[PDB]
Amino acid sequence: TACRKHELYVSFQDLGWQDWIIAPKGYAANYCDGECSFPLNAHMNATNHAIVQTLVHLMNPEYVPKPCCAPTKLNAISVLYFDDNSNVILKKYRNMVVRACGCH
Amino acid sequence: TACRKHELYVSFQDLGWQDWIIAPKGYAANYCDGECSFPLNAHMNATNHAIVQTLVHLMNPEYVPKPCCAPTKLNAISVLYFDDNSNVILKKYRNMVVRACGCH
Numbered sequence: 001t002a003c004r005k006h007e008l009y010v011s012f013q014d015l016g017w018q019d020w021i022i023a024p025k026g027y028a029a030n031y032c033d034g035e036c037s038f039p040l041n042a043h044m045n046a047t048n049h050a051i052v053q054t055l056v057h058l059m060n061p062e063y064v065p066k067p068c069c070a071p072t073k074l075n076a077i078s079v080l081y082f083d084d085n086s087n088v089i090l091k092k093y094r095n096m097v098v099r100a101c102g103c104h
Numbered sequence: 105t106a107c108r109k110h111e112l113y114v115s116f117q118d119l120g121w122q123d124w125i126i127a128p129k130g131y132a133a134n135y136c137d138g139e140c141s142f143p144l145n146a147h148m149n150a151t152n153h154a155i156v157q158t159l160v161h162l163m164n165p166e167y168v169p170k171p172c173c174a175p176t177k178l179n180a181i182s183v184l185y186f187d188d189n190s191n192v193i194l195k196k197y198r199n200m201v202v203r204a205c206g207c208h
Contacts, residue, residue: 008168010156031157032208033169047199049178052114053135064112065137068172070208074153095151104174104208 003034003045003069005101012079020081022088027077032101036067045072045102054103066103073100107138107148107173109205126184126192136205140171149176150207158207175199176206 011026012018037054040046050067057064075097080090115130116122122129142158144150154171161168179201184194 008160010160014163015156015159029153029156029160031168032172042199047175047178048197049133049135049175049199049202052119052133052200055119056112056114056133059118064135068136068174070172070174071151071153074151093152095153096156098153104172 001034003032003036003101003103005098006031006033017081020083022080022082024077024079028097030098032069032071032098034069034101036069036103040103047104050103068104069101070104071098071100072102072104073098075099105139106145107136107140107205107207109134109202110137124186124188126186128181128183131181132201134202136173136175136202138173138205140173140207144207148204148206154207171207173205174208175202175204177202177204179203 008029008031009026010029012021036050040051040054042048042051053067057066074095076092076094077096078090078092083089112133112135113130114133116125140158144155157171161170178199180196180198181200182194182196187193
């Protein structure tokens with residue numbers, strides 16, 4: 001249960017685009033989850049602030065929370081879809097897929 | 105209650121580092137806390153992935169978590185301190201001061 005990438009497939013049908021969209025029908029979003037605690041590394045899986053915040057949190061747990069597990073690397077996906085007129089449109093959406101997670 | 109920056113002063117004395125850290129004595133570190141839900145404000149430049157994750161969380165609160173509230177802008181601080189060898193060292197530390205929080 002440490003801060004890590006969890007798999008998550010998201011279907012455009014559930015997002016309301018089942019009409020326009022030709023392909024893909026969904027994509028692997030994934031998501032970051034898990035607790036942020038030592039060991040931490042300001043050059044890989046954390047920031048300085050996260051480290052300092054963790055320390056401060058350990059010696060004051062009620063008032064200051066742990067940092068939270070969030071993406072460090074996101075990828076784009078491309079979708080092909082229909083228009084009013086039968087226009088086939090290819091469109092790239094950035095920061096759509098989680099590839100890596102870290103404590104922030 | 106929403107995702108936002110909170111004041112937090114960090115004194116190197118509370119941390120136990122007063123012995124060797126020459127300057128500064130401490131610094132406004134701040135941190136991020138609070139719910140990531142809609143309305144997902146402009147100022148908090150949420151990624152695409154975050155918009156999706158919030159949606160999916162709404163449909164599956166038990167399965168997928170809310171995005172995590174985390175720094176969008178950090179500042180560096182410089183610290184002057186003694187080595188264990190008594191060398192006087194100056195070192196700019198990045199990602200030290202939380203200046204803005206987003207949803208990630």
